[PDB]
C-alpha cells in the first residue's frame, strides 16, 4: 500500500537456493566496469564515470534519479558493477576446501583417484548427503599417494605422484616426491595454475565430488572478477556537516583498485620477478581482508586511525551484526516506554496509559458506513485535542498531515480511506517487560487513558512480569491492523493467561497489601 502499483504478480518465497556466482554471470548482471580509484571527477562536483561512485550504480541522494531504473532513491535497490582482476586470486573463505580438493584429484588431468571397482569406495558413493559422501571419498583417496595412469586398462591418469599440499597463510605449498630418498622440490601452487586444472574436471567427476554443475562449479571458488556493491551497501556519512568520510569498504575497494592497476603496470616493462611476487601477493592480501579481516596467524589490516578495518565477515557476526542485530531482532515503530506504577482500582486486564503517549501513538481505522459520522468528529478536533486524529490516508497512499492543514473543515471522508486516530479506551495493546523469560512476559491489556506519566498496572499482574515499582520500565506495542487486534484479544489477553502450562497452576494471585489484609 506504501508501494506504488506494479503489474508484476506478487508471490512469496518458497525456497532459497545457495550457490556461487560464475564469472560470466557477474558480468551479465553488472551495469558498469570499474577501473579508476579516483572517486571524484576533479573535485569539481559530479562523480567520475567508471569510478566507484559512478551514477549508474545508484542514487543515495534525494535529487538525482537513477540512470538505470528511473526510480527515486527510496525505491531504487541499487545495481552491481564488476571489477576485472588482472590475475586470478583465491577466495579467502574457501581455501581449506580447495586444499581438500587437491588431495582428491590428479594435479595434471583432474580425475578422481578411485573407481566403483574398489568395494568400500563403491559403498561410499551411495551416501545420499553430498557433504558426507565427499568426506567419505576423501577419507579413502587421502592414502592413495600417486595418481595411477593405469587401473589398479587406463583410467585417464597421467602417472604422476601426488604432492602433499600444505597451507601457509594465504599461500599453498605442494611437496612432490620425485622418484630411495632423494630430494623433493616444493614449488608454490599459484591460483592461476590451480585455475586451469579445475576447468578440466569432467562433469561426472564434478558430481562425485559433491559439487553441482549448475550452481556450485568448483572453479568458481577462485576469484577472477569482483562484484562491486552499489552505494546502498557502503553509504557516506557526514562527521561535521560539510565533511564526509567514506565507509571502510569504499576505502578498501580503492586499495584493491590501485593494487590492480600496478599488476597491469608490471607485465609490460620492468619486472624484476621478485617484485612480481610482492605485488601479486599484496593483491591477494587486500582481496582477502576485504572479505574477512580475522584471518588467524597474520596481522589485521588497519585503518590510518589504527583500528582494524570492518570487513564483510565482521558485518554479519556477533550481537550487533546483520543477523543477530537486524534480522532476528530489530527496532520497531509504534512503541513506548516509561516508569510503571500500581493501581488497585483498575481491572486485571487494564493498563493506564498517559495522555501524552496516547496522543503520539495511533491506530489506522478504516472508514465504513457505521463509523463515518464518528470519525469526522475526530478529524475536526485535530492532532492537539483528545479525542482526535493525525492523518487521513487515501487509497492511493497520499497522507494528509493534519498539523499543517489549515482547511481541515473542508475534508469529506470517502469509504475505504483510513484515519489514523488517537489511541482510545478499550483498544488492545501488547505490554512487555524485559527480560522476556517466558510467555507471560507479553500479555495484551486494554488501554485506559489517564493523566500523569506512568503506566498503571493492576497489582495482581506484577508477579508474572516479575515487575515491581522501584524504577522498572515496561514497553507497550500497538497493533496496526484489524487482523492483529483480534489475535491479541483472542489469544494473548490477560484472563487467558491466568493458568500457566509450566506447572498446571496459576501464576497470578492476591498479593501484598490485599493478601495481608484479607487474612
Amino acid at each position: 500500500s506504501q508501494f506504488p502499483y506494479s503489474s508484476a504478480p506478487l508471490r512469496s518465497v518458497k525456497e532459497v537456493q545457495f550457490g556461487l556466482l560464475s564469472p560470466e554471470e557477474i558480468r551479465a548482471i553488472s551495469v558498469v566496469k570499474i577501473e579508476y580509484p579516483e572517486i571524484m571527477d576533479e573535485s569539481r562536483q559530479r562523480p567520475r564515470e567508471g569510478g566507484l561512485n559512478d551514477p549508474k550504480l545508484g542514487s543515495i541522494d534525494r535529487n538525482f534519479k537513477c540512470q538505470t531504473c528511473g526510480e527515486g532513491m527510496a525505491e531504487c535497490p541499487g545495481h552491481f558493477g564488476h571489477m576485472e582482476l588482472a590475475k586470478p586470486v583465491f577466495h579467502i573463505g574457501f581455501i581449506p576446501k580447495i586444499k581438500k580438493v587437491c588431495e582428491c584429484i590428479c594435479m595434471n588431468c583432474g580425475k578422481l583417484l578411485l573407481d566403483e571397482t574398489n568395494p568400500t569406495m563403491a559403498q561410499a558413493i551411495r551416501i545420499r548427503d553430498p557433504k558426507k559422501r565427499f568426506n567419505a571419498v576423501w577419507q579413502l583417496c587421502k592414502t592413495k599417494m600417486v595418481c595411477e595412469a593405469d587401473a589398479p586398462v587406463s583410467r585417464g591418469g597421467c602417472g604422476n605422484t601426488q604432492p602433499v599440499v600444505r597451507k601457509d597463510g594465504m599461500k599453498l605449498w605442494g611437496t612432490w616426491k620425485k622418484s630411495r630418498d632423494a630430494q623433493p622440490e616444493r614449488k608454490l601452487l599459484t591460483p592461476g595454475e590451480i585455475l586451469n586444472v579445475f576447468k578440466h574436471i569432467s562433469p561426472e567427476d564434478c558430481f562425485r565430488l559433491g559439487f553441482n554443475e549448475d550452481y556450485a562449479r568448483p572453479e568458481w571458488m577462485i576469484i577472477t572478477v569482483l562484484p562491486v556493491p552499489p552505494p546502498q551497501v557502503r553509504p557516506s556519512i557526514a562527521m561535521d556537516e560539510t565533511t564526509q568520510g567514506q565507509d571502510d569498504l569504499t576505502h578498501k575497494l580503492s586499495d584493491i583498485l590501485k593494487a590492480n592497476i600496478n599488476v597491469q603496470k608490471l607485465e609490460m616493462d620492468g619486472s624484476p620477478q621478485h617484485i612480481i611476487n610482492e605485488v601479486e601477493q599484496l593483491l591477494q592480501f587486500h582481496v582477502a581482508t576485504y572479505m574477512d579481516n580475522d584471518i588467524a596467524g597474520q596481522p589485521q589490516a588497519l585503518q590510518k586511525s589504527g583500528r582494524p578495518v570492518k570487513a564483510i565477515r565482521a558485518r554479519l557476526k556477533g550481537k550487533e551484526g546483520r543477523l543477530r542485530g537486524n534480522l532476528m531482532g530489530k527496532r520497531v515503530d509504534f512503541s513506548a516506554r516509561t516508569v510503571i506504577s500500581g493501581d488497585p482500582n483498575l481491572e486485571l486486564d487494564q493498563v493506564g496509559v498517559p495522555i501524552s503517549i496516547a496522543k503520539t501513538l495511533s491506530y489506522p481505522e478504516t472508514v465504513t458506513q457505521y463509523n463515518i459520522h464518528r470519525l469526522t468528529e475526530y478529524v475536526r478536533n485535530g492532532p492537539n485535542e483528545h479525542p482526535g486524529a493525525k492523518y487521513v490516508i487515501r487509497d492511493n497512499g497520499d497522507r494528509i498531515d493534519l498539523r499543517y492543514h489549515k482547511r481541515a473543515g473542508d475534508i469529506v471522508l470517502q469509504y475505504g480511506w483510513k484515519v489514523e486516530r488517537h489511541l482510545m479506551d478499550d483498544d488492545p495493546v501488547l505490554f512487555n517487560r524485559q527480560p522476556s523469560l517466558h510467555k507471560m512476559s507479553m500479555m495484551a491489556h486494554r488501554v485506559k487513558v489517564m493523566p500523569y506519566s506512568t503506566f498503571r498496572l493492576n497489582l495482581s499482574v506484577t508477579s508474572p512480569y516479575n515487575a515491581d515499582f522501584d524504577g522498572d520500565e515496561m514497553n507497550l506495542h500497538v497493533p496496526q491492523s484489524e487482523e492483529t487486534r483480534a489475535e491479541l484479544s483472542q489469544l494473548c489477553a490477560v484472563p487467558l493467561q491466568i493458568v500457566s502450562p509450566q506447572s498446571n497452576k496459576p501464576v497470578m494471585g492476591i498479593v501484598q497489601d490485599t493478601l495481608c489484609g484479607v487474612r
Partner: protein
C-alpha cells in the same frame, strides 16, 4: 489429488483457538472493507463485534484448509465445525 474426500475427513471436529482467532480477524477485516454482512447489526457496530456475532450464529462464509504434514489437506467449512 491432494484433497481428501468429505466422508474420509479425520481431523478434529472442534474449532481450535488458533483457527477461531484467524477466522474472527479475517472476517472482521473484510467487514471493515465493506463486505456484505450476513447478520442483522443492531447497536454493536465495532468490526470485531459484528464478526463475533456472525460466529455465534454459525454464519461466517469461510472454509478452513487444514494442512496435514505430508502436504495433503482437508477443507472444513466454518459452518460445520463445532464451536465451544
Amino acid at each position: 489429488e491432494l484433497a481428501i474426500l468429505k466422508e474420509e475427513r479425520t481431523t478434529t471436529p472442534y474449532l481450535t483457538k488458533y483457527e477461531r482467532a484467524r477466522i474472527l480477524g479475517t472476517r472482521a477485516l473484510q467487514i471493515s472493507m465493506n463486505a456484505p454482512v450476513l447478520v442483522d447489526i443492531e447497536g454493536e457496530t465495532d468490526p470485531l463485534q459484528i464478526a463475533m456475532k456472525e460466529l455465534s450464529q454459525r454464519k461466517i462464509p469461510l472454509v478452513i484448509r487444514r494442512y496435514l504434514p505430508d502436504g495433503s489437506y482437508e477443507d472444513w467449512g466454518c459452518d460445520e465445525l463445532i464451536v465451544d
